[PDB]
């Protein structure tokens, strides 16, 4: 997916959520 919080992308949203919820990059 796509993440503006920090240059990050993944195979699917489920990972974006995890990436957003993991606190790796908060906005
Ligand atoms: Zn991000």
Descriptive account of the structure:
It contains 1 helix and 2 strands; from the N terminus they run E-E-H. It has 27 residues and is α+β, with helices and mostly antiparallel strands. The chain has one domain. The protein is globular, with a radius of gyration of 8 Å. The N and C termini lie far apart (17 Å).
Q: Keyphrases for this structure?
A:
27 residues; alpha+beta; 1 helix; binds zinc ion; metal binding protein; degenerate zinc finger; ZNF750; ZN750
In short:
With 27 residues, this protein is an alpha+beta fold. It has 1 helix and 2 strands.
Distance between the termini: 17 Å
Molecular shape: globular
Largest sheet: 2 strands, antiparallel
What proportion of the residues is helical, as a percent range? 25-40%
Query: What string gives the helices and strands in order?
Result: EEH
PDB class: metal binding protein
Keywords: degenerate zinc finger, ZNF750, ZN750, nuclear transcription factor, protein structure evolution, somatic cancer mutations, psoriasis, skin differentiation, DNA-binding motif, CCHC zinc finger, antiparallel bba motif, protein folding, protein structure prediction, seborrhea-like dermatosis with non-arthritic psoriasiform elements
Assembly: monomeric
Entry title: NMR structure of the ZNF750 zinc finger domain, Z*
């Amino acid at each position: 997916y796509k993440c503006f919080q920090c240059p990050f992308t993944c195979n699917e949203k489920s990972h974006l959520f995890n990436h957003m919820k993991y606190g790796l990059c908060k906005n």
